[PDB]
């Protein structure tokens, strides 16, 4: 019977709700008040990455923190040597609409995923000079919205069909499928302990999944709209999501509930992108009002304004040494921020 | 350095290639084909191609002008997040089964028209299966007054263009569905973006022309908005 299991699920959701309430003896906004703020950060543009043809819908940085992959909706994937503003490996795509790109932690591989239901993996460091196809990771019934490379031969891909998928790039078939969500799934991030990832979707619930165990560990229903943005806290023990509701929220992993809200009454525009600069003392939440707002994620106030775009910021990422912030936007440009 | 110099020159090379592909991007006018899994969304593809993949690129060159038209099949029924990938297109071709009763397509049009990112994107609107509409409202088996009570107080407008040999009830019905879409069109986006309602069948070969003659006015309208002339 459908209704008795539905009522059991609602009662168990209430059990999770008052278990989260029972472990919320004092919230993080209450206990972090003696610490001084960072202040008005006059973070500015260092590098303006011009040359993308259409709206830059996603990007990723690297562990070398000098090369960044950027996917814009023209049908071109551009690696950017950010220290010298060089267009490394701009390559024509099978699909004009690419919605995501990741950069391999070693640096060999990138992941063109978009409308085509294909995460085509492209090997940058080939003996060839054209960045040829490793293989097209096909098999999804929804748009590829985010990807994150586990290793050279292993990737998790966020897809717009309620399913994430851990793949196997040496074989081309899905190693495991993460089917717990009810809405199409936008955003992805891997922890420093890379075997444990977290993924946000359009049902206001980001879930923490296991790569090796293969399915869901934790569920977070703290938002109230469609999660475009997710990233771990840089210890791999918490994670922040941003959505369409003009309210970023930071969740824990050792706790099952929300740590903080990030919502200025003046922000009536949603969030597309978040990233972290080796610390949760500073969180970047690219918004829909064409500029990025820096929230101090221990005092929940607007620490900074990145007003350097004439269109919406669709992808913001911090270098893995914390050096820079590249915000690619719908103006076809990435601004690099320090 | 010199590998910094050679990397800057290689990047100049990348751009040289980006400009040669920006010739075939900026002179290419992107179309987003949408429907409600009942219109002639597929047969339009099967007629202007001859003149598990989630996007279909159809490359048709009309009046020696290239057009990439993007059919969204093999995607899920949720729209709101892959629709944001198409706010730099020239047009969204909303194809509607004007004979199938329609309001679901009217809410789809309400969503596309009043999307915060597509509010600069003007919709080419294809009232397709006008032959099925003509064999539906002349038969009288299914009426629109049941599905729309403002059709009872609707009269055909004086700027309407009826076909030679077309029945007045067919013209009144088809322009009522057009005016149903233009209640949405003339509500939020007045001159920012402007709808293009025309009438389509599965037989007419004028569809690529009707796309060209509309996208002409579309990019003229955004060019005039660039001077704020609209």
């Amino acid at each position, epitope marked *: 019977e459908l209704d008795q299991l539905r009522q059991e699920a609602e009662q168990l959701k209430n059990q999770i709700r008052d278990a989260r309430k029972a472990c919320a003896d004092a919230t993080l906004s209450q206990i972090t008040n003696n610490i001084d703020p960072v202040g008005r950060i006059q973070m500015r543009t260092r590098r303006t990455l011009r040359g993308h043809l259409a709206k830059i819908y996603a990007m990723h940085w690297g562990t*070398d923190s*000098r*090369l960044l992959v950027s996917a814009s909706q023209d049908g071109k994937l551009i*690696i950017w*040597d950010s*220290y*010298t503003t*060089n267009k*490394v*490996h701009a390559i024509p795509l099978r699909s004009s609409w690419v919605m995501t790109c990741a950069y391999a932690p070693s*640096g060999n591989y990138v992941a063109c995923g978009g409308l085509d239901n294909i995460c085509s993996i492209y090997n940058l*460091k*080939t*003996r*060839e*000079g*054209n960045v040829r196809v490793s293989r097209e990771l096909a098999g999804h019934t929804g748009y590829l919205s985010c990807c994150r490379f586990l290793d050279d031969n292993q990737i998790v891909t966020s897809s717009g069909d309620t399913t994430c998928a851990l793949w196997d790039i040496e074989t081309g078939q899905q190693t495991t499928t993460f089917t717990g969500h009810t809405g199409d799934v936008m955003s992805l991030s891997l922890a420093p302990d890379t075997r444990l990832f977290v993924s946000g979707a359009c049902d206001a619930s980001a879930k923490l999944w296991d790569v090796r165990e293969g399915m869901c560990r934790q569920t977070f229903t703290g938002h109230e709209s469609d999660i475009n943005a997710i990233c771990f806290f840089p210890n791999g023990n918490a994670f922040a999501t941003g959505s369409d509701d003009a309210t970023c929220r930071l969740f824990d992993l050792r706790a099952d509930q929300e740590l903080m809200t990030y919502s200025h009454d003046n922000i009536i525009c949603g969030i597309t992108s978040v990233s972290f600069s080796k610390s949760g003392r500073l969180l970047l939440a690219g918004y829909d009002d064409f500029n990025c707002n820096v929230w101090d994620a221990l005092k929940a106030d607007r620490a900074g304004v990145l007003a350097g775009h004439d269109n919406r910021v669709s992808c913001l990422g911090v270098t893995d040494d914390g050096m820079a912030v590249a915000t690619g936007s719908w103006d076809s440009f990435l601004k690099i921020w320090n | *350095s*010199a*590998e*910094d*110099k*050679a*990397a800057v*020159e*290689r990047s*100049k*090379m990348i751009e*040289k290639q980006l400009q040669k592909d920006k010739q075939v991007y900026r002179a290419t006018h992107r179309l987003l084909l949408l429907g409600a899994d009942n219109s002639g969304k597929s047969t339009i593809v099967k007629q202007m191609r001859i003149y598990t993949s989630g996007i279909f690129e159809t490359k048709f060159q009309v009046d020696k002008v290239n057009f990439h038209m993007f059919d969204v099949g093999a995607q899920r029924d949720e729209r709101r997040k892959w629709i944001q990938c198409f706010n730099d297109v020239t047009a969204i071709i909303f194809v509607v089964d004007s004979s199938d009763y329609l309001q679901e397509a009217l809410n789809d049009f309400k969503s596309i028209w009043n999307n915060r990112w597509l509010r600069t994107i003007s919709v080419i609107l294809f009232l397709n299966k006008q032959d099925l509409l003509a064999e539906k409202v002349l038969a009288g088996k299914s009426k629109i007054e049941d599905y729309f009570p403002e059709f009872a107080r609707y009269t055909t407008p004086e700027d309407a263009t009826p076909e030679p040999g077309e029945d007045p009830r067919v013209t009144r019905a088809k322009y009522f569905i057009r005016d149903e879409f233009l209640r949405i069109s003339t509500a939020s986006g007045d001159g920012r973006h402007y709808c293009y309602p025309h009438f389509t069948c599965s037989v007419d070969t004028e569809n690529a022309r009707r796309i060209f003659n509309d996208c002409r006015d579309i990019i003229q309208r955004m060019h005039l908005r660039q001077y704020e002339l609209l």
Partner: single-chain antibody
Amino acid sequence: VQLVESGGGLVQPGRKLSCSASGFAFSSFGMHWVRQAPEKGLEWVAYISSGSGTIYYADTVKGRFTISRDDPKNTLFLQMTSLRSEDTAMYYCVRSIYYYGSSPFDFWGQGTTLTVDIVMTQATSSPGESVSISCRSSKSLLHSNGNTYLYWFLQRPGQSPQLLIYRMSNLASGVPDRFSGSGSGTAFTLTISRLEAEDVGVYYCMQHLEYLTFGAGTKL
């Protein structure tokens, strides 16, 4: 990826060298010409860039050598008007590409036996012993970008050399993990953790601050 050139042959003292390439996108590669004299360390000749943009020479072949590509036909020519006694050398084209984390000089052409600045000098003219190959520069090679530009080369007796270490931040693809480069700006030591069979070759070094000396090499 394969490079083969047919240019070299008998030539009276006083010819074009097509370097037909295959297996890669030739239009995006810096293509060098490097000539090693018989019983001598390879010396660099010329370099044409990706898309034929910037063209450099060894400041001794500027007035008499010229270089060009043909990219739809996927080949390259080195037109060579004047041939003195210096050019009694076997020509090799090192394939190369320049970006961050790139591998320039990784694969070299098979060769054409032709018969008619910063100065690198090695510390040695000529099992499993952990040997360190030394190399000396005339100035500091640590540039302000953070990359110390030296390129190591291992040549078997009788086939083309290949890249060992690029810029001493990472190692190449075809090299094993036994090679490791280190340096401070003038002294430049490449160490082998486990010397193996077929690893015997001549060791060259290169700088990329300015334009490209090699050194005589260390035979093993």
